[PDB]
Design a protein around this nucleic acid. Structure first.
Ligand SMILES: [Zn+2]
Ligand SMILES: [Zn+2]
Ligand SMILES: [Zn+2]
Lengths: 59, 57, 105, 588, 207, 109, 201, 172, 83
RNA sequence: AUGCGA
């Protein structure tokens, strides 16, 4: 991923970030991972599941 | 000096020999055709300086 | 297609913050660092950098002369004819410049 | 070009403007100080014109990016000029402004309130409010400072009102107003302004008698004496050579004291950048160094001759080092040496050296500004018949093109062109492979570069090129079964392979015959490869549009490489769309 | 109007002998749903009235601009130059007897066809008409009392010289002005230099 | 101005008519309108070109350095409209097929 | 004037947030949600899945990856919206419009998306499960995702070795499981992103 | 068509020191298929067919320890007509560093080749018409050349008409 | 800049230049694996395919007619009279 | 740059 056909020309934020709660983070994680599971990114998604597991209590 | 001048045709001297140009005096015999070879020695030029003129008189 | 695409079409670096296509350079990599696009004009000398009154983390890039820079990471690539690059050669000597605008940074 | 490599950062405009020595020093990849060019009889001199910081060379990587001669784009160095000198291109300008100043007050010899009136007109003409610019002249009332300030107040009030109206009315914008008529009214105004600026043959704001300024032509200004009537008039109001340095020190202060008008005098549009107008723009305190990439030597068949830029720039560096040597004389002398007039010769070195270096910078800019076939400078490089702009910008050589003597043939269509199989096998189209063209391109690859509708090369979606110039029928057979392979990298999953197929009977080609005299002389014809031909074959019906005849006429054949250029050459430029001329609409 | 279209735009009789073919090309039923067929035609009727009312150049009743000024000629069929409209109507009137020999075409369906040909003959948005102009003046100038040919064209186009080489002013002479009066006036305006009257000059320098 | 315009179109029409050349009046009429665009008799040489707004078009005709100097001294900005100027920067020419843009309608569901 | 340029350094080099310790007993909320605007390319092959095109092309490679602009490793995206190229179409249309380049079949579009980014800063107190223990570092893993290492020099000498043997804490028992540290530095110039931690502050 | 070439090894040498290149070989490692064109003395066999890429000579420079060759670069094949060894004007130069090689390129009449009468009415050959397809006279012949009649009305080359009828009478 | 759809005032007809660009760009898209919305019917030339797509007006392209002011009119293929 | 082909 090195050129326009893969990488965005420009990225800008429109507001100052918002400190998503643990509960909002977990709900986002579950919705994103669950919606995506239904491609080497899958392996990073597996890491997101570990984050999910770490934000769930136990590895 | 005469091989160089005869090999380029850029004749230059402290009087200019009273001639309107300092190049073009020499031509390759270009023997590609006997017609061309004999024609070179019966060719005469009005000179480059009149080649530069815009008119036709 | 004729006067460009089939002649000297070049994707050339331009600095989105300074509007020139000739200060751009490839920053030097390291065993842990890739080659990164940097604009020389948009980079502070690591010897200054308000260091007397003052880092982001990823704004230091190094020159083949081992020179540290801060910034210069805001340049992109745009399609132009290479002779255009030839213009900075003479024009930049002429003490003038091209501010090649684009996008809207 | 590749359709597989888009960009989305197009240039939308081009700003022009002068550099600054601090900008050059900050961007500069190196200072070049050594008038040497090569070292060890065969090496790039350290910190010289061929230092590797100025790009890659001789398998030496660019010392500024570490990139090969085939990869390094190159980087621009700079020269710290001994003195300041004069920018030739603006020498006519700065000379005018020298003649326009007052030397005892350092103001323009034109009435200050009249100057402010000029600033008003040029401000209204940045927004192109011409009717208001002319309406300003009407504001009218020994003249008190309260009254001249009342004129400045009323005029500023008119600028503020006419602007507030025009921005309210959207009849202009913060970005200015620019049209052919506005440009013309500006040039007219700035001309009359320069005539008023030059008209004052003594000052007015200070009443002082400025000297008459004379010039050599391109390297020296002199300051003429005054008359005892004017000198004693100056006291009651109480030719000399000058250096570029003195001019710079005067013009800095004059250009600062008159910044308020010059803000709009030096911009035809609003200076949004609040850029101060500095005198250092007409003088060169430093000199840049072009990329080595553009300084390569002139090798003609075998002979390697040094670049003429290296020669003129080396002359600047040598002369500059001589002046540096005079500065060595200042470290040398100047302890005190109270009566050593010995420096009377070093003073000849200062005048001669200084005019000499200035002249040599001029010569490097414009050969016709120095003092037998003098290497050309950038001014000669850019202009005349060539004008880099004309010979390599407004027209260029092009790839995917052929030239050949045309031969008649009545059996082809009147819209086709008979392409000899040398061109049919030597001209390619970059065809992306799909499910619908896999058969044809697989066959073309199987044929190889040495057949008919085969294909010379295959460009992967990964960007790499695989030439078929020397592959065997076996290897090309193997690649034919790989033209349709799956994705491999998320970086490339959106692309499909490309095949450089030979020109064939389904492509359109743009034929041009010199005379171009009109658009109808360069039409698109449908390619028909003719066997055992060696000449571009053309139907007789076209010969009255090209004004072509088989006597020996040669034609250029252009092969467009893009579906946009194909569709246009089949729909807009095509011969059938040219059955009538626009001159008269009589069939040609 | 595009020059590459105009050639037959004023050849009505030909279009008539090929009426049904051109009706098959430019069939309007496909297009009559995308445009207006009346607004311009109505302006054409009121303006044709005012135009026949004022059919002296600079004491006419200026009030009605041409239909091309008031309606996009590509959108309301009938917005056409008054010269073309005039020629078309005059053709339909001078051939009413040809309109009494046809299978059945009429000046309203034929006039409709010629208006639609006019709409379909217009220059496309974006046409490179500048370049086309320049080539249409240059290219034919290669075949080339007052200055003629290329020097004359250069004297105008290239230099716009305020000093013509052969400046002339044409003077129309009233119908009442006799030819003999005209020769008298020709003598009366021409310059007469003093040299032109001198026969001999004898200087006897004595000192 | 209108009389000089009609005189131009008549004089050029006479020059071509002398050689029995047909030339559409639309061409001559356009050229005349362009020579009078400022209300005067603005020839087509460098002098008339000075008043045009595209600095690259000036640069690419004649006195390249003179137009460059007058441009820099102005701090001019090129709005990159001239076809020549646009070629200089490797931009789709604004004439003809580049007189407009093409976008795509794409399904959102 | 000489303070415009220093306003340029401070106001251009300012940092947005200082993620605090949750309840002052957890870890810093370096995970934040920030709505951004990106400019991405759309291939023709996704012309029938354009939001999915933008996803598979640009946004999918961004997850679990550091972005200098966002200041962290993108934890995920929320609410993709293609900015319509054409007004007078409300906001809920059945098709959008996008500009195609004047040279290629590729499209370019504006996108608005919320990013979930892990934005750690120096001073943040974090806990990790010990990955490794070598005599110059202790490897840990934050949330089972972020690699972290505390080199011997940044650990208090008052810590105790037990022989790759084992480290024993300053209290007199060997370390085990999780460690609480302050963030000294984050190294993202390499292939991945290593967070430099300290046990001495 | 004959093209003459000078293969010089001093064209820009530098006296005694410089000399080291000798036509021939040394490393053996060269492709022995070069003998297919160059004789064991380093000069091509007079008569050899050569196509672009074939070696026109081979030599050896001690500094490079390599067998080098001067390649032939042309659009068409030729044949070597003469190879002339030049030691001349030299003081010693015994190493035979200058060689003149003449290439013979045959030029068959072909479509596009120009032909002209003694009347300045020049034309390219549009095609090489089959003899069967040519027109044949009742004399049993088919012409060598066919010239379009419509060329004469503008040129008024009627001297060519008379030359045709005079050459016909004079041949008969 | 947005010329309201109710206010579009330009030629209802597709110019030859408009048709040329549409057919070229759309053809190029089909040649880069844009989804074909019509039967390929045997064809292999992407340009003739785009011509078929124009013949059925299935093309999903829009012409942005520029005005020198900067206002523009977004026109569908499915409305601009093709010829 | 000279000559020259169209
Ligand atoms: Zn920059
Ligand atoms: Zn470099
Ligand atoms: Zn004064």
């Amino acid at each position: 991923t090195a050129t326009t056909l893969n990488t965005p020309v420009v990225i800008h934020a429109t507001q100052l970030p918002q400190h998503v709660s643990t509960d909002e983070v977990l709900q986002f994680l579950e919705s994103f991972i669950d919606e995506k599971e239904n491609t080497n990114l899958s392996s990073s998604i597996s890491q997101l599941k570990r984050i999910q597991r770490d934000f769930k209590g136990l590895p | 000096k005469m091989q160089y001048f005869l090999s380029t045709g850029n004749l230059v001297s402290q009087s200019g020999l009273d001639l309107q140009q300092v190049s073009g005096y020499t031509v390759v015999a270009e023997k590609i055709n006997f017609y061309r070879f004999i024609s070179h020695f019966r060719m005469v030029h009005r000179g480059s300086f009149f080649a530069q003129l815009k008119t036709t008189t | 297609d004729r006067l460009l695409n089939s002649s000297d079409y070049t994707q050339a670096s331009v600095c989105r913050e300074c509007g020139s296509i000739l200060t751009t350079q490839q920053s030097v990599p390291r065993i842990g660092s890739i080659s990164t696009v940097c604009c020389r004009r948009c980079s502070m000398r690591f010897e200054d950098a308000k260091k007397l009154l003052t880092e982001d983390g990823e704004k230091i890039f190094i020159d083949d002369s081992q020179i540290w820079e801060d910034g210069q990471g805001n340049k992109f690539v745009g399609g132009n004819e290479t002779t255009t690059v030839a213009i900075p050669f003479v024009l930049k000597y002429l003490d003038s410049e091209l501010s090649a605008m684009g996008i809207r940074l | 070009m590749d359709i597989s490599k888009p960009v989305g950062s197009e240039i939308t405009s081009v700003d022009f403007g002068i550099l600054t020595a601090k900008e050059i020093r900050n961007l500069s990849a190196k200072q070049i100080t050594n008038p040497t060019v090569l070292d060890n009889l065969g090496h790039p001199v350290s910190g010289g014109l061929y230092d590797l910081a100025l790009g890659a060379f001789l398998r030496n990587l660019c010392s500024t990016c570490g990139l090969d001669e085939k990869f390094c784009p190159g980087h621009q160095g700079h020269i710290e000029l001994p003195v300041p000198c004069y920018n030739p291109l603006f020498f006519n300008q700065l000379y005018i402004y020298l003649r326009a100043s007052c030397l005892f007050c350092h103001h323009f010899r034109l009435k200050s309130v009249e100057v402010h009136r000029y600033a008003c007109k040029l401000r209204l003409l940045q927004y192109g409010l011409i009717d208001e610019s002319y309406k300003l002249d009407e504001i009218t009332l020994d003249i008190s400072s309260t009254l001249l300030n009342e004129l400045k107040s009323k005029r500023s009030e008119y600028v503020d009102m006419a602007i507030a109206k025009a921005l309210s009315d959207g009849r202009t914008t913060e970005r200015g107003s620019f049209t052919a008529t506005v440009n013309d009214e500006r040039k007219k105004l700035v001309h009359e302004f320069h005539k008023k600026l030059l008209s004052r043959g003594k000052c007015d704001n200070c009443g002082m008698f400025s000297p008459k300024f004379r010039k050599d032509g391109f390297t020296k200004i002199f300051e003429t004496a005054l008359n005892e009537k004017q000198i004693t008039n100056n006291r009651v109001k109480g030719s000399t050579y000058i250096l570029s340095t003195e001019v710079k020190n005067i013009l800095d202060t004059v250009f600062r004291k008159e910044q308020c008008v010059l803000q709009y005098v030096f911009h035809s549009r609003p200076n949004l950048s609040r850029k101060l107008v500095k005198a250092d723009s007409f003088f060169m305190d430093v000199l840049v160094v072009p990329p080595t990439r553009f300084r390569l030597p002139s090798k003609l068949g075998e002979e390697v001759h040094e670049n003429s830029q290296n020669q003129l720039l080396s002359k600047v560096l040598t002369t500059s080092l001589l002046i540096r040597d005079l500065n060595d004389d200042l470290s040398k002398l100047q302890k005190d040496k109270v009566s050593l007039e010995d420096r009377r010769v070093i003073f000849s070195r200062l005048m001669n050296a200084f005019v000499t270096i200035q002249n040599d910078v001029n010569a490097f800019i414009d050969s016709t500004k120095a003092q037998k076939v003098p290497i050309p400078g950038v001014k000669q490089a850019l202009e005349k018949k060539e004008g880099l702009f004309r010979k390599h910008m407004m027209g260029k050589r092009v790839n995917y093109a052929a030239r050949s003597v045309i031969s008649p043939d009545p059996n082809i269509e009147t819209n086709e062109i008979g392409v000899p199989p040398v061109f049919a096998v030597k001209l390619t189209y970059p065809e992306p492979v799909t499910a619908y063209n896999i058969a044809e391109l697989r066959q073309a690859v199987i044929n190889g570069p040495d057949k008919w509708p085969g294909a010379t090369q295959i460009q992967n979606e990964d960007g790499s090129l695989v030439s078929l110039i020397g592959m065997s029928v076996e290897q090309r057979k193997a690649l034919a079964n790989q033209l349709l392979t799956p994705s491999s990298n998320v970086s490339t999953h959106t692309l499909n392979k490309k095949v450089y197929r030979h020109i064939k009977n389904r492509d359109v080609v743009l034929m041009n015959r010199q005379p171009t005299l009109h658009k109808a002389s360069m039409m698109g014809h449908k390619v028909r490869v003719l066997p055992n031909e060696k000449t571009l074959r053309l139907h007789y019906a076209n010969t009255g549009a090209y004004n072509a005849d088989f006597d020996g006429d040669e034609m250029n054949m252009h092969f467009p490489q893009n579906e946009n250029a194909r569709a246009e050459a089949l729909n807009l430029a095509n011969t059938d769309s040219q059955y009538l001329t626009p001159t008269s609409g009589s069939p040609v | 109007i595009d020059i590459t279209k105009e050639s037959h735009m004023t050849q009505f009789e030909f279009c008539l002998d090929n009426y049904y073919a051109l009706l098959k090309k430019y069939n309007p039923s496909a297009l009559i749903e995308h445009l207006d067929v009346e607004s311009a035609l109505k302006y054409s009727k009121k303006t044709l009235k005012y135009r026949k009312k004022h059919s002296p150049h600079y004491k006419q009743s200026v009030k009605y601009d041409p239909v091309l000024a008031k309606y996009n000629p590509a959108k309301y069929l009938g917005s056409v130059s008054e010269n073309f409209q005039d020629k078309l109507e005059s053709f339909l009137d001078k051939n009413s007897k040809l309109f009494k020999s046809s299978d059945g075409v009429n000046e309203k369906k034929f006039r409709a066809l010629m208006q639609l040909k006019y709409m379909r003959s217009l220059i496309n948005p974006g046409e490179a008409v500048g370049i086309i102009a320049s080539q249409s003046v240059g290219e034919p100038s290669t075949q080339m009392n007052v200055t003629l040919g290329i020097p004359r064209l250069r004297e105008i186009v290239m230099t716009a010289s305020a000093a013509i080489k052969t400046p002339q002013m044409t003077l129309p002479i009233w119908n009442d002005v006799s030819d003999e009066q005209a020769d008298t006036f020709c003598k009366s305006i021409s310059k007469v230099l003093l040299s032109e009257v001198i026969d001999k000059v004898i200087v006897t320098e004595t000192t | 101005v209108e009389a000089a315009r009609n005189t131009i179109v008549n004089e050029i029409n006479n020059v071509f008519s002398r050689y029995a050349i047909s030339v559409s009046f639309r061409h001559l009429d356009l050229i005349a309108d362009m020579m009078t665009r400022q209300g005067t008799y603005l020839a087509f040489n460098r002098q008339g070109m000075e008043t045009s707004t595209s600095s690259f078009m000036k640069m690419s005709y004649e006195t390249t350095c003179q137009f460059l100097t007058k441009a820099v001294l102005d701090n001019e900005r090129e709005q990159l409209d001239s076809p020549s100027a646009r070629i200089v920067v490797g931009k789709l020419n604004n004439v003809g097929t580049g007189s407009f843009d093409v976008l795509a309608k794409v399904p959102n569901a | 004037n000489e303070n415009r340029e220093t306003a340029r350094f401070i106001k251009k080099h300012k940092k947005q947030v200082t993620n605090p310790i949750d309840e002052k007993n957890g870890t810093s909320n370096c995970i934040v949600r920030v709505p951004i605007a990106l400019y991405v390319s759309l291939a023709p092959m996704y012309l029938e899945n354009p939001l999915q095109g933008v996803m598979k092309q640009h946004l999918n490679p961004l997850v679990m990856k550091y972005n200098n602009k966002v200041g962290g490793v993108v934890l995920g995206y929320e609410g993709l919206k293609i900015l319509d190229a054409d007004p007078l179409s409300k906001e809920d249309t059945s098709e959008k419009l996008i500009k195609i380049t004047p040279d290629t079949p590729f499209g370019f579009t504006w996108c608005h998306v919320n990013l979930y980014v892990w934005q750690p800063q120096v001073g943040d107190v974090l806990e990790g499960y010990i990955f490794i223990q070598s005599a110059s570092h202790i490897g840990l893993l934050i949330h089972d995702a972020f690699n972290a290492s505390i080199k011997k020099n940044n650990i208090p000498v008052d810590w105790t070795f037990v022989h790759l043997g084992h480290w024993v804490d300053s209290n007199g028992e060997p370390i085990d499981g999780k460690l609480r540290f302050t963030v000294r530095n984050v190294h993202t110039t390499g292939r991945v992103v290593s967070v430099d931690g300290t046990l001495i502050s | 068509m004959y093209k003459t070439e000078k293969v010089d090894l001093a064209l820009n040498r530098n006296r005694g020191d410089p000399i080291t290149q000798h036509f021939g070989f040394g490393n053996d490692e060269w492709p022995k298929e070069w003998l297919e064109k160059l004789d064991e003395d380093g000069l091509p066999y007079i008569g050899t067919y050569v196509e672009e890429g074939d070696p026109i000579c081979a030599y050896f420079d001690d500094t490079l320890n390599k067998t080098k060759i001067k390649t032939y670069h042309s659009s068409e094949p030729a044949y070597i007509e003469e190879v002339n060894l030049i030691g001349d004007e030299s003081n010693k130069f015994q190493e035979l560093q200058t060689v003149s090689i003449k290439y013979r390129i045959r030029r068959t009449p072909q479509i596009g080749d120009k032909f002209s009468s003694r009347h300045g009415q020049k034309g390219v050959c549009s095609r090489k018409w089959p003899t069967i397809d040519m027109p044949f006279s009742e004399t049993g012949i088919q012409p060598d050349i066919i010239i379009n009649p419509h060329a004469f009305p503008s040129r008024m080359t009627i001297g060519m008409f008379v030359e045709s009828l005079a050459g016909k009478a004079g041949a008969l | 800049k947005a010329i309201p759809k109710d206010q579009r005032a330009t030629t209802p007809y597709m110019t030859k230049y408009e048709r040329a660009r549409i057919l070229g760009t759309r053809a190029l898209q089909i040649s880069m694996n844009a989804p074909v919305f019509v039967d390929l019917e045997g064809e292999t030339d992407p340009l003739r395919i785009a011509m078929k797509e124009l013949a059925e007006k299935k093309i999903p392209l829009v012409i942005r007619r520029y005005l020198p002011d900067g206002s523009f009119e977004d026109w569908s293929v499915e409305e601009l009279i093709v010829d």
